[PDB]
């Protein structure tokens, strides 16, 4: 019953802050990041519940939670193309596309924040480090150290080759083969028998198409 009082004092503190700076947590990206960074060092989670103060007051939760649904939709509308694996970049363009060219600006940073909370839902979303950036995974599937590595090799060209694998990894043909077999079995790659020196294995998640995302929704 102690802090009970001090709590509705904090409401006021926040409410006052809220009306003076709501739009700033929209106009300004480094601002939301700054905000969220501060909450962390303390030990408060402004996105843990829509029934939290920062949420109701700052419209931060409904920002992130709507963002989350939007991440889910685009990943669904493209699962058929890329097996459920998508670059944080493609994922960022499409989210903007969906959000209209009349503002609301979102950053890769936000996308992450949202994705890390969607994990609360259980198995489905994952973040994977490739090269400079990340791949966002939305259908649960495996991701050995071995699979990831080969993912990395495919970054630059969108495809990968048994030779290319062996040459950098120093593996033996078998290890390469199962890895590639796993990717084809999970829909993450497609065999190509018309490239120059051998079978190329293209991963649509790498490989820049993106051209119109319609009807499969």
């Amino acid at each position: 019953a102690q802090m009970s009082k001090q709590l509705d004092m904090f409401k006021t503190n926040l409410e006052e802050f809220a009306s003076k700076h709501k739009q700033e947590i929209r106009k300004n990206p480094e601002f939301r990041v700054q905000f969220q960074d501060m909450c962390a060092t303390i030990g408060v989670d402004p996105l843990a519940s829509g029934k939290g103060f920062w949420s109701e007051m700052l419209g931060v939760g409904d920002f992130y939670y709507e963002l989350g649904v939007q991440i889910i939709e685009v990943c669904l509308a493209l699962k058929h193309r890329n097996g459920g694996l998508i670059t944080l970049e493609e994922l960022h363009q499409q989210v903007l596309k969906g959000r209209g060219k009349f503002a609301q600006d979102v950053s890769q940073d936000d996308l992450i924040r949202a994705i890390k909370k969607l994990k609360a839902l259980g198995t489905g979303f994952g973040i994977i480090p490739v090269g400079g950036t990340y791949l966002i995974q939305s259908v649960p599937a495996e991701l050995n150290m071995d699979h990831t590595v080969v993912l990395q090799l495919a970054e630059k060209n969108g495809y990968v080759t048994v030779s290319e694998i062996k040459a950098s990894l120093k593996w033996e043909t078998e290890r390469a083969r199962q890895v590639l077999e796993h990717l084809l079995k999970e829909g993450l790659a497609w065999l190509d028998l018309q490239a120059p020196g051998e079978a190329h294995y293209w991963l649509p998640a790498l490989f820049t198409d993106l051209y119109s995302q319609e009807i499969t929704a």
Binding site: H80, R81, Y159, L184, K185, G187, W190, L191, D192, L193, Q194, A195, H200, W202, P204, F207, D209, Y211, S212
Partner: protein
């Protein structure tokens, strides 16, 4: 109006796929593409020889083409679904319908 689907722009779309689920997805796209290709250029029939060599199955510049055998599998799917009637005991020329 008539868009080339992402798949057409995608090299392995020109290779029958070993994964059974992807192959179903590939062929399904391949059926759709042939249907609306013929609709666009107002063509209710054509021979396989022309088919093989037309832009439909030959992407010059992606430098990939649907090998004859495969193109036979799609044709067959289209027949299997109604949209195709062979004009030929030899399966050498075909009629494509939108019914």
């Amino acid at each position: 109006s008539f868009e080339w689907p992402w798949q057409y722009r995608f090299p392995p779309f020109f290779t029958l796929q070993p994964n059974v689920d992807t192959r179903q997805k590939q062929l399904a796209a391949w059926c759709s593409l042939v249907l609306s290709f013929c609709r666009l250029h107002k063509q209710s029939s054509m021979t396989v020889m022309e088919a093989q060599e037309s832009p439909l199955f030959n992407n010059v510049k992606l430098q990939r083409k649907l090998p004859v055998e495969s193109i036979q599998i799609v044709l067959e799917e289209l027949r299997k679904k109604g949209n195709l009637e062979w004009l030929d005991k030899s399966k050498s020329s075909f009629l494509i319908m939108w019914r």
